[PDB]
Symmetry: C3
Subunit: 403 residues, 3 copies
């Protein structure tokens, strides 16, 4: 294609010993064979610059899990190819000119025992560095037992060992139980992706440092997470548009000195944002929160099992700044739980020195803008509602009502 052996076209690559295998029949086998070719040529610790695998637009079945265990591998298509399988699956498609995702289109047809389309993992040192996934579509094809389960055991990309400077951009993920998982992420960027109609969208697991999640469109399923981070330090979440219907839109557990800023959140259940298990010294600011109710008939009775006293934001930990957010709550009174309760917008479940400053709430019913658990200490609530919209069971919260 170019005059470098480090540039591969999946539609031009022949597997020696399996001449009839195509990118169309099993792109997984083609890419595994390409990776082996790279390893045979790049044979010393000073001769491993990596390579690019090009996926032209087309429909490709992946039956064999790809194991990515080389630094500086780029897998690149020409299009994210997103299509709403959810709407397709639940309406009359008579006369429809298209019935499936496209672009650089990988249909994920992995076996139950190696279900991740791409497994990014290396035993040995150093950390896998500078791997790039961009501009292609990962499509789980169907949910089981029906299209509305958000279950199929499939993952798009699973990074399973400690990693540095991975870049995921311009991707499409659809109808995967898990779109993207990154364990032990350092200096990761999940940037300008379409991640929707997946059980779970982006799971940043184990721990991490110096990560950016920015400019993504994300929508998960009622039993799954949209964005999850575990034990992240210095995670920055900005410019994302999170829409239904994950159990949560942003879920942090043991995350400290992180920032969630300049995002839009739309959710159909309580607990759209969760700072769990002691999240300390985080900035939660300049975000738009919309709590509404399900309007797509196939999901109207679905629930994440939480009631309206849980909070739009549910925070457990110390010294978070929750400031300059707008909350627009509109849930029919017959769909609030428990019956006749005032919904809670921000729940401080516990922790020391949390500050809630300059937040505007609109609700269709009487709501507590802020409830602070009795266990909360040295809390500040500034200009986040009149006295009658703030409930402190904690005896030492300083409250300045909105004048």
């Amino acid at each position: 294609p170019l005059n470098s052996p480090n540039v591969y076209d999946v539609t031009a690559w022949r597997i020696k010993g399996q001449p009839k295998v195509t990118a169309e029949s099993d792109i997984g086998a083609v890419i595994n064979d390409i990776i082996a070719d790279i390893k045979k040529r790049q044979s010393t610790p000073e001769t491993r610059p990596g390579a690019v695998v090009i996926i032209p637009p087309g429909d490709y079945d992946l039956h064999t899990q790809v194991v990515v265990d080389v630094d500086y591998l780029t897998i690149a298509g020409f299009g994210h190819g997103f299509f709403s399988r959810s709407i397709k699956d639940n309406v009359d498609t008579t006369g429809w000119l298209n019935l499936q995702p496209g672009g650089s289109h990988i249909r994920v047809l992995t076996p139950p025992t190696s279900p991740q389309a791409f497994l990014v993992r290396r035993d040995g040192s150093p950390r896998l560095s500078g791997i790039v996934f961009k501009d292609f579509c990962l499509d789980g094809v169907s949910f089981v037992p029906d299209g509305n389960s958000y279950k199929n055991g499939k993952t798009g990309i699973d990074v399973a060992s400690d990693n540095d400077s991975i870049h995921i951009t311009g991707m499409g993920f659809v109808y995967l139980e898990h779109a993207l998982i990154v364990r032990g992420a350092d200096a990761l960027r999940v940037h300008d992706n379409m991640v929707a109609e997946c059980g779970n969208c982006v799971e940043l697991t184990g721990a991490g440092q110096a990560t950016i999640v920015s400019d993504n469109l994300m929508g998960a399923g009622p039993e799954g997470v949209t964005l999850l981070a575990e034990n992240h330090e210095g995670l920055l979440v900005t410019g994302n548009n999170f829409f239904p219907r994950g159990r949560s839109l942003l879920e942090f557990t043991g995350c400290n000195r992180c920032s969630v800023t300049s995002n839009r959140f739309q959710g159909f259940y309580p607990g759209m944002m969760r700072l769990l298990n002691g999240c300390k010294e985080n900035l939660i600011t300049s975000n738009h929160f919309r709590r509404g109710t399900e309007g797509f008939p196939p999901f109207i009775d679905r629930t994440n099992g939480l009631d309206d006293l849980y909070g739009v934001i549910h925070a457990m930990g110390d010294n978070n700044l929750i400031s300059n957010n707008l909350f627009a709550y509109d849930v029919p009174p017959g769909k609030i739980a428990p019956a006749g309760a005032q919904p809670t917008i921000m729940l401080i479940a516990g922790g020391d020195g949390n500050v809630i400053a300059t937040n505007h709430v609109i609700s269709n019913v009487d709501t507590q803008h802020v409830v602070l658990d009795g266990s909360a200490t040295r809390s500040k609530v500034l200009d986040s509602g009149a006295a009658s919209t703030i409930t402190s069971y904690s005896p030492d919260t300083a409250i300045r009502p909105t004048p």
Copy 2:
């Protein structure tokens, strides 16, 4: 070029029976012929993954409107090719080594009766999905009758039917009366583009959901819009650098539960930001606003027809949070209208529950930081100026002066 029939090089493609029609002579006609080839091969609703059209760097005339009516079409160049035709048209260009835009350079030379270079439109179902425009230049060549009119009747890209997951990134738009129009946008991303010296930059018309406009440079013309949204919900506008000389920099009509955060706004006219016709429950926070006067001599006398009492922000609607913004106003008294007027920074023209909080205003003359119309109800003004800079004609406004 690659071993896929879904990869087209506009410079390699020949129209059978029309050998003199090339990318150079009419790239419009070439791309229409490419799209006819896609439809010929991709002939069922399960065999339409789409294609990529590659535009090498070069100068290409477009005489024939391109009709994009296939999902997952990527039109991709190698460069946005932006050049200030405005400065070129108004100074001595003796010894200049370049006089026009470049990169993947499409010169829009459309007839008055099909004036849009790209018309993205499908009568039928489903919605056009996953179309990508990236890394090329759309150049309308000249404004008439001279370069300073911002008039030529040309559009760069017009999405005229309901769409899902379209991606516009790394583009250059110059000297078009309309750069980009997207009607009925769902999950649209307008990201990291150069949209400047156009009459209008980005018009998101009719309605839309779950859209992101991020990381763009935009400058329009005195009769046109920079960013317009009509009846959008959950529009996120973040990380953009809006400069002159649009009639406005951000104009919403009937937009609800949208967010404008972490942007730079510089304008030379009143009404830089307009929330019009009942915009409700929007977040306007962490933005920098600069109101100056025209410095470029050719435009010194140009105006958008509004006076300095219209507002830097003009808001008509309910329950908006306008907080944590800086306004730098510097207009010579000789250029203020009406003469001797105290300029208004934020005008609440009407509506219920609007909150103005923690805003810093610098002005070269005495200004009212906030003016609230007599019709405004349950308004809050906090820490947005001394008492002498806040004017409420509404009797129920709660005002805390800056200490």
Copy 3:
């Protein structure tokens, strides 16, 4: 490769008369010859659309400085190839599967007479427009005399003449004394790059207009800047993750009406943010600041030579809004200078009308959240700590303590 003479593959280009020079032996010489070919063919101000130079993944030595003096030149690889040379240089690498950066890997071996790998410079007119650097690695190979100096007199990209609409995206910079320099930057976008283990990361010098620095991962050296801007107007710095160990993370000199919003800052020294020499009317908001101490043994005793009274933010200028930020200070008392001092979080070193509002500080020791110099005039401090945490040496500071 494509049917355009404006598309160049560095691995396929032969220098006439120098048949032994490959992209591997001296990519600098190959790219200079490509640029000579462009100038041969593109010889009038209406025939200069530019070109793309494609760098396949691989290891390339650059001995010869590239002079970029054409508009709309795109230099594009397929990967940023980042690798921590710093960790490699300071631990036992026995059994390591990789020992250097990769992707589209340019090893910068420039002589001291021409030390910048890419010099972007045109004497003549007009300003260089629309140049794109993307998706390749600039690697200075080693620091002098050892890995921990952050000195080698090498620069990755130096834009030395006035420029418009330059785009730097998806790059990797490692082990350069200066990664990226852009002088007289107009409508520049430094977007989604890895700029790390460089003495200095991004230097925006001389002056500039309408620039965006967004979505970058940056970490510099203790004698150098991470982001520097000189005399910038309307610079937007958003969505960046700045980590150690620059002397500073953000350093402005004479920058006015700029916005630093929605970033993450981690530093190991005082003066993480410096608004020097009359920075006025700047928005510093919705940022997370973490002041810690060095944990990486080779640097434990390295300092930027500043004491803890310098400030996490050091501000010399008028009418800045420093608002809605979180500061997490944790420095062992034995590492605070001078001994027994209260660290300063925000120092107003001088200037008129600065506003400090809605900032949350956590420290391990007694700290002054805000100190205002004797020279500070008409300062305002709101809800940024108790009265005992605010020091005004100035007699005219209006102070509202956190309730």
